[PDB]
Each structure stands twice: as structure tokens, then as C-alpha cells.
From a paper:
The papain-like protease (PLpro) of [name]-[name]-2 is essential for viral propagation and, additionally, dysregulation of the host innate immune system. PLpro can revoke these PTMs by hydrolysing the isopeptide bond at the C-terminus of cellular ubiquitin (Ub) and ISG15, which results in a dysregulation in the production of cytokines and chemokines and type I interferon response. PLpro is a monomer in solution and has a right-handed ubiquitin specific protease (USP) fold which consists of four domains—the N-terminal ubiquitin-like (Ubl) domain, the thumb, palm and fingers domain. PLpro binds ubiquitin and ubiquitin-like proteins at two distinct sites, S1 and S2, thereby providing specificity for K48-polyubiquitin (K48-Ub2) and ISG15.
The hydrazone compound H1 binds in a polar groove at the S1 site of PLpro between β-strand β8 (M206—M208) of the palm and helix α7 (V165—H175) of the thumb domain. In this groove H1 is stabilized by eight hydrogen bonds. The central carbonyl oxygen of H1 is the hydrogen bond acceptor for side chain of R166 and again S170, while two phenolic hydroxyl groups of the terminal benzene substituent are hydrogen bonded via one water molecule to the amide nitrogen of M208. Further stabilization is achieved by C-H···π interactions between the phenyl ring of the compound with the side chain of E203 and the pyrrole ring with the aromatic side chain of Y171. At the core of the ubiquitin binding interface around residue I44Ub are four non-covalent bonds between ubiquitin and PLpro (one hydrogen bond, three salt bridges), all of which are likely disrupted by binding of H1. Interestingly only the hydrogen bond is lost due to direct sterical hindrance (M208/G47Ub), whereas the three salt bridges (R166/Q49Ub, E167/R42Ub, and E203/K48Ub) are disrupted due to side chain reorientations towards the bound ligand. While the hydrogen bonds with G128ISG15 are likely disrupted by the sterical clash of H1 and the ISG15 loop comprising residues F126ISG15 to P130ISG15, the interaction between N151ISG15 and R166 is impaired due to the movement of the arginine side chain by 4.0 Å that forms a hydrogen bond with H1 in the complex structure. The hydrazone H1 is binding directly at the center of the S1 substrate binding interface, interfering with residues R166/E167 which are highly important for substrate recognition. While the thiosemicarbazones show no inhibitory effect on substrate turnover at the tested concentrations, a significant inhibition of the ubiquitin cleavage can be detected for 500 µM of hydrazone H1. Surprisingly, ISG15 turnover in the presence of 500 µM of H1 is not reduced but rather increased twofold compared to ligand-free PLpro.
Author numbering: 1 to 315
The structure:
Amino acid sequence: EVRTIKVFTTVDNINLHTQVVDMSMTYGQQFGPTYLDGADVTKIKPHNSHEGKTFYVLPNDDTLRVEAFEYYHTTDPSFLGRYMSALNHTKKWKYPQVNGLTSIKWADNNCYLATALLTLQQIELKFNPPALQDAYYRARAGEAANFCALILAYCNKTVGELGDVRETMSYLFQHANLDSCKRVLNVVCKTCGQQQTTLKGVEAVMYMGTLSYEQFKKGVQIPCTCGKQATKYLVQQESPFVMMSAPPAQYELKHGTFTCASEYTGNYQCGHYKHITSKETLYCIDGALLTKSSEYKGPITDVFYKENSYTTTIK
Ligand SMILES: O=C(N/N=C/c1ccc[nH]1)c1cc(O)c(O)c(O)c1
Ligand SMILES: [Cl-]
Ligand SMILES: [Zn+2]
């Protein structure tokens, strides 16, 4: 007896492609690598309950290649497999609402993702790939599994791998529309004079070296090619936020002077992030956990600030 069922294949879970599969052969023998809501069914034969269901496959014809690129803005051949592998885990995570924001219950070293997700919900940012647009909308509503799996895939991190928040934000920002963002800096050395530089896009909203936006405006000390220490300060800023990052160090966060921040306790190869948000008071969100305080001091590694347009007064 020959037995078949109808299923649909997809790369973006929107555009469906009708298929007829032989129930005596595995999905892999018929489609190549195949996934059912994240689960790898490549070595599995069709079941009756599969009729009418949607399966992800790899982009193995030109139609799927175009659909995949338009949705994800990547042509990495291993992307869909990494996204599905992550999703099979992230769909089992829990996403509690904590102080009005979608968080993530701790699992699989996902603290860096929780902090990143909580941060995104407090800054003005639009994603460019439809995959991220669609999944971020769902994440804001509380169903963040597909968004978290996409972050992992885009960042080339597997579930359980230790992650860095600054690096993760850099990747997400690279897939965001920051074309309107502009930064002008000036650098003064007593021996070499001045040099002004203009930064755009991701480099216009991120800085590595100090956590304090105010000190960035007053001036920070850096090396120069001659051997002297030069001073760098912010001349002009056009962006809806800025992100200031530094190696973790004890730092005091004062209510009302920042938007949110990331706290890291541990060492290079192992640690834990928490999220601090400045609202009516200071709330510390640690996955599902919530505490509050009027003051905060801790090992801070990233601080986010509101912005619109800033121009210096330094002459
Ligand atoms: O993140 C930064 N660049 N990102 C690059 C990238 C490519 C793909 C993913 N990320 C970055 C670079 C700098 O030179 C900074 O001075 C800085 O603050 C940030
Ligand atoms: Cl978006
Ligand atoms: Zn110099």
C-alpha cells in the first residue's frame, strides 16, 4: 500500500508550499533537513497527525532562497538550522511579565538575553529584517520564544552558551534602522592638536570605555600615537538613546539619571547579569525576580540613556 499525506513546507512560516510526502520515507529523504516547530524531524517518517502541518526546510530552490533572504536578511547556510535548534529550547522557557515588561525566567545561561530583551523594551528601536520585526512584536506581547531563538541565531550563540550583553546589542543594532543616528567627537592632544571625527549608525550610539554619559560630555582620557594622553569629548549627538559600556566595575546608579543598565557579577568565563531600570524607583529585574531600592551600587557594565539632540557648549 502506498500512503501519502499533504504537508506544507516553508522558510518564513508565512509563505506555504504544498507537498505530498510518502509515509514510508523520512522527511530527510524527501525534503532534506526538516523541522516541526523547532523539532528536527529529518530522520522521522510522516505521521497521520502531520497532515496539513507546516514544516521548515532549508532554502534548497531559488524561490525559498529569495523568501528566506527577504525574511531574515542573511544567506548563512546554517542559519535556519541554528534558529530551529534554539527554538526547540526557547519555546520551553517562561516569559513572565515583570514590572510591565516581558522578561525571561532563568534557564540555560540566558541572563544576558533577559537583560537585552528588557532593555529593548525601554529604547526606541526598529528592526529591519521582517523576521525580527514580527518576532519582536510577539515578544513585547509576552510570546518571546521566536525572538530569543532569532537573537541566538543572529549572534551565532547556542542555548546555554555564555553571552555578552554589549556584543548582543551590537548584533541587534546592526539589524536595526539607525541611519538617522549621528555622533561628532573631538580629541585633543597637547602635542598633536585636535582631531574631530563623525560616527554613524551603530558606532554613533555605542561607546566602550566609560559608563557615564555626563563624563563623555565633559571629556575622557585616552592614549595618543605620540605617547601623551589626549582628551575625547562629545561634540554633537543625534539619536533616541545612547549606550555607554565599560569592563564591569563598582558603579553608582542614581534614580532619574539613566534609563536602564546591565549588572554583571563573576569573571570572564562565567557570571550572571541582572537588569536595573529607573522608573518611579530603581527596580532590579533578575529574570523572574524583582527587587527595588532607592539607591544602587554594583558592578555595572552597560548603561542606557535617553537622547534626542545634544550639542556641546565646549568651545
Ligand atoms: O559594536 C561595534 N561594532 N559592531 C560591529 C559589528 C559587526 C557585526 C556585528 N557587530 C563597535 C565598534 C566600535 O569601534 C566601537 O567603538 C564601539 O563602541 C562599538
Ligand atoms: Cl521592529
Ligand atoms: Zn599626541
